[PDB]
Design an enzyme around this catalytic site. Structure first.
Site: not given
Ligand SMILES: *[B]([O])([O])C1=[C][C]=[C]C(C2=[C]C3=[C][C]=NC([N])=C3[C]=[C]2)=[C]1
Lengths: 9, 243
Positions: B40, B191, B189, B89
């Protein structure tokens, strides 16, 4: 010392 | 990550930082020329040329003595990735070698992480470290500067799938980790982050078992993070890592 193995011991 | 503390400089040799355009993601060095991330992150399909990978970093976007910067020669998203379910993913980054035929230049701060055994049955008792440069609390203004890591227990699929947890949203290839009580979690953040979990049968006792994929709200109650189950994809990783 060489790498430490990534294998099941 | 929420509920964690700054990681030691030598604590995360495997973790990699990924920069392009306005975007950022993390990933894991699983071999000297290969990074494993979340698909993603690369959903929008940027050009390898615009991608910059930095290994050996401690502070997000901060130049440092052990740091190593690298181009990306190509990358592969899993063919069955869905941007709706986030099933499957994961993605592979092929690092560009230099004139000596080297990609990552290993050192105490830059080293690959062991891949998961897979065959061994997953257990609730197993404990894992999650790491990243994302939000340290929900509603956070910026991304962390120093790498955070936090300790979280593995969560069985039968209990993550249960209707009080995430229910029907949990599919084959996913895995959960964290306290049903809340408090400790990866966040936005984070991810592409590596979930490294105890493996009693491994010589290093520690293997890459998840890729930070998704959740609902930084550390909320009854909502563990959802990760890509790396052991589920060993054959895919071996097959597209000969490459
Ligand atoms: B990423 O940096 O691309 C990214 C964007 C949006 C959301 C997430 C994310 C949020 C999250 C919230 C609560 N628990 C977990 N495990 C997550 C994972 C990833 C990442």
């Amino acid at each position: 010392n060489g790498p430490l193995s990534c294998g099941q011991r | 990550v929420v509920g964690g503390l700054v990681a030691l400089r030598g604590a995360h040799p495997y973790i990699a930082a990924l920069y392009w355009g306005h975007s950022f993601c993390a990933g894991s060095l699983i071999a000297p020329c290969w990074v494993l991330t979340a698909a993603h992150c690369l959903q929008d399909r940027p050009a390898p040329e615009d991608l910059t990978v930095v290994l050996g970093q401690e502070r997000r976007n901060h130049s440092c003595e052990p740091c190593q910067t690298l181009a990306v020669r190509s990358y592969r998203l899993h063919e069955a990735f869905s941007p709706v379910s986030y099933q499957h993913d994961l993605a592979l980054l092929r690092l560009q070698e230099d004139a000596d035929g080297s990609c990552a230049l290993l050192s105490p701060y830059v080293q690959p992480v062991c891949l998961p055994s897979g065959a061994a049955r997953p257990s609730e008792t197993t404990l894992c470290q999650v790491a990243g440069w994302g939000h340290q609390f929900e509603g956070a203004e910026e991304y962390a500067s120093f790498l955070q890591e936090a300790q979280v227990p593995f969560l069985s699929l039968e209990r993550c799938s249960a209707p009080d947890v995430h229910g029907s949203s949990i599919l084959p290839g996913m895995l959960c980790a964290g306290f049903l009580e809340g408090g400790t979690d990866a966040c936005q953040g984070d991810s592409g982050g590596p979930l490294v979990c105890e493996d009693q049968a491994a010589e290093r006792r520690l293997t890459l078992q998840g890729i930070i994929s998704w959740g609902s709200g930084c550390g909320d109650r009854n909502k563990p993070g959802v990760y890509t189950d790396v052991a589920y994809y060993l054959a895919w990783i071996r097959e597209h890592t000969v490459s």
